[PDB]
Symmetry: D2
Subunit: 201 residues, 4 copies
Amino acid sequence: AVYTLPELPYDYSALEPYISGEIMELHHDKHHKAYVDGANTALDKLAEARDKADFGAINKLEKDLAFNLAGHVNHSVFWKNMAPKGSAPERPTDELGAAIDEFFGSFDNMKAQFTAAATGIQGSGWASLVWDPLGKRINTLQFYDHQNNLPAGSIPLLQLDMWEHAFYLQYKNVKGDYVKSWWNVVNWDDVALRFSEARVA
Amino acid sequence: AVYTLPELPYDYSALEPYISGEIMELHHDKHHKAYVDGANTALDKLAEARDKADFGAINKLEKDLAFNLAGHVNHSVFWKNMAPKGSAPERPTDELGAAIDEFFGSFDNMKAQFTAAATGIQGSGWASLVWDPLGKRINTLQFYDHQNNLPAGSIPLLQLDMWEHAFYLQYKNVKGDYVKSWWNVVNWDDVALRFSEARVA
Amino acid sequence: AVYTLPELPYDYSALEPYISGEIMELHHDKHHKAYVDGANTALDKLAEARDKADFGAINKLEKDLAFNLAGHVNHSVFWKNMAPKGSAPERPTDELGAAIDEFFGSFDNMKAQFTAAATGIQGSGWASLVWDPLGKRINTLQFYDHQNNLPAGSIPLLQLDMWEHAFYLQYKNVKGDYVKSWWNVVNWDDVALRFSEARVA
Amino acid sequence: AVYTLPELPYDYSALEPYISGEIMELHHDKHHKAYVDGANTALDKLAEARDKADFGAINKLEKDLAFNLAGHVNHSVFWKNMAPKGSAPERPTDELGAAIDEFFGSFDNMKAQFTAAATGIQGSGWASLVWDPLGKRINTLQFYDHQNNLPAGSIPLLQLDMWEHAFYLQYKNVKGDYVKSWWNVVNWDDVALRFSEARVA
Ligand SMILES: [Fe+3]
Ligand SMILES: [Fe+3]
Ligand SMILES: [Fe+3]
Ligand SMILES: [Fe+3]
C-alpha cells in the first residue's frame, strides 16, 4: 500500500502514569490504523475515477483524502514527539531553545500560548508548533479536526492531540490535567531533529 | 514586517486575454495585500497576548493567522505559477512530466482530476497539486477558503484560485471557461522548480 | 420536484441604483437555480441509497443536501427581504421596532452589529438576524458559506448575502459600500411579518 | 441569565445498561453546563461590544455564540429524546409513523439512513432527524461539531450525539454498538410531540 501504520517507538505503557497504555493501544491500533486504511482507500478511488473518467464523487474523495491523510500525518508525528519521562530532556536546548526564545520570548511564553491553543479548541483538533517556511519562523497553530485551520507548507514540529479519544478514558472532561501531564513526556530531541530538517523550507 | 506583498513577475495585463488586467490589479493590489496585513496583524496580536499573559482571544488569533497566512501563501504561489503565453512550454517535460504520468497515468488524466476538483468546490476554495512528503507522491487537494481541507506538510506545486473574485468580472458564473483559459498561462518551469526543491525532502 | 425556484417579487432592475439588475439576473437565474437543482438531486440520491441499501456516499449526500438546501433557504429569504426604495419603511416599527430596541438597545446598535458581522466574514457567508426560539430573543449570526455557524431551530428574519457574487460586478472589493447601499432596499414589512410568525417557536 | 441548564427528566442511571450513569452525569453536569455558560458569556460580550461601539472581536463572538448555543440546543433536545426502556413504544405510531413511511419508505429505511449518517461522521458531530419547513418533509442531516452542516430554519425532532464524550467511556471506539444500544431508549412520544408542533409551520 501507499501508506502504512508506523509502530510505536516504545511500549504501550511506556508513557505512564501520564498517558495510560489503554489509551495508547486504542489510539494507535484502532484510530491511527483507520486513517491509514482511509487514506489508501481514497487514493484507490481517485485512481478508479481517472480510469473511467468519472469524477462525480470528487468532492467526497478529496475530503476523504485530506481527513485521513492529515490524521495519519498528525498521529505519526504525535508518537515520535513523545518519550518516557527521563528518556529525553525536559526542556529545549541549543538551536531549538534559541529559536523558541526568538519567536516567543521564552520557553514559558511558548508553553503558555501552546497550552491556551490546546484547551480553547471548539470541537476536535490539535495544538501545533510549526515551521513557517515563508516567514522563516516558528508559530503555533490550532488545527480543527485533522485537516483544517492551517497554511499549506506548514511543517509540524510538535503536536498535541486534543480529540476526546486522546484523553477521555483517563482525564474525563478535564482537558487541563491532560495538557499538564503531557508536557512531562515531550521528546525535545525529536522536536529538535524536525526543526533541523524543517528550517530548509 | 514579517510578511511582505511580493510584486508580480509580469505586467498586470500580460496574462490577457485569459485573465484580464482589471482582475490582476484588484486581485494583487487589494486582495493579496489584505492577507499580508492580516497575517502581520495576527502575529502582532499574539505577541501582545504573550506580553500581557492574556490568551482570551487565542481562538480568534489562531484563525486570523491561519486564514491570512494561508491567503498570503496561496496567492504568492499563484502569481509565480503563471506566465505570459509563449514564455514556457504548454506541457510538462522531463522530471515533472515523468512524475505526472507516474502518479496520474497521463497529463490529460491529471488535468481532468484537477479540473473536477476546481469546478466542484462548494464555497470559496482552491484546486491544488501538492507534493506529499509522507507518501512521496503528487496528489491533488481541494482547499476550502484558504486554510481548510489539507494535511500539514503539504508542499504546493501548482494552485488555481477558485474564489469568485478571481474570475467573476470576466467569466461571471461560468467557472468552467475560467479554468479552461487558465491552463494556457500555466508556467510549467515554475512548477518544475517547486517539484525539484520539494522532492529533496 | 420537491424544491422550486421562486420568482422575484419585483423586476430585476427594481433595486437600482443600489443593486444592479445584472447582478440580480445572474444571482437569481443562475446561482439560486443551481441550489434548487442541487437540493433536489441530493434527495433523489438519498432515495436511491435507501432502495439499494447502499449508504456509501452518505457523507457526500448529507453535505450536498445541507449546502444546497441552505443556499435555497437563504436566497429565498434574501429576495423577499428587499424591495425598491420608497416601497417600504426605511426603519422597523411597532413590535419589531420594540423587539430590536429590547435585544440591541436601539436600531442603530443593531445596524452597527449587523454591519460588523457582514464585513468581517473570512470567506463566503451571510450576516443574519434570527429569532432564537430557545432564548426567545433576536440575535445576529454570521453564517459561513450557506450552512455553517448556526444553531438548529434558528429562524431567519433578515439576511445579507456576503458571497462575492452578490456584489463584485458593481462594488468590486469594497464590501463596505455594498453593505451601506443594501440598507436602502431592506423591506422592513417582510421582516416584521417573519417576526410575527417566528416568535411562536 | 438568558440560558439555563435544564434538569434531566429521569435519574442519571435510568438509561442503563444502554447508556451508563457515569456518562450521563459527566455529559449533563459538565459538558452541557459548559455550553450554557458559554452561550450566556457570548451574549454578555456582544452587549458590551455594542455599548463600547467596538466590534473588533465580532468574528470570535459570533462563533462563540453559534457553537455554545447550538451545543445547548442539541443537548436539550437529546435529553428529552430519551427515556427508560418501557416508558414509550419501541416504534413510531400514528401521525409520526405515517410521516416516516412517507419520507423514508419504512421505519427500517429511516433507521438505516440515520445510522449511516451517525457512524460516518469525520470528526465530532450529530445525526439528526429534522422537519424541513420549506419542503414540508422530514430529512436526516449530519451536523459537524454542533453548529455546522445544516440549513437555517431546520427544526430538530430526533438527535443523536456522536461526539466521543457521548460514548467513549462505555463503548470506546466502537461507534456502531453505541448507536445500536441507543435505539432502545428513544422516546418516540417526545419526537411525536415535536413533529406535531413543528408541522404547524
Ligand atoms: Fe487522535
Ligand atoms: Fe484570490
Ligand atoms: Fe448568493
Ligand atoms: Fe455531547
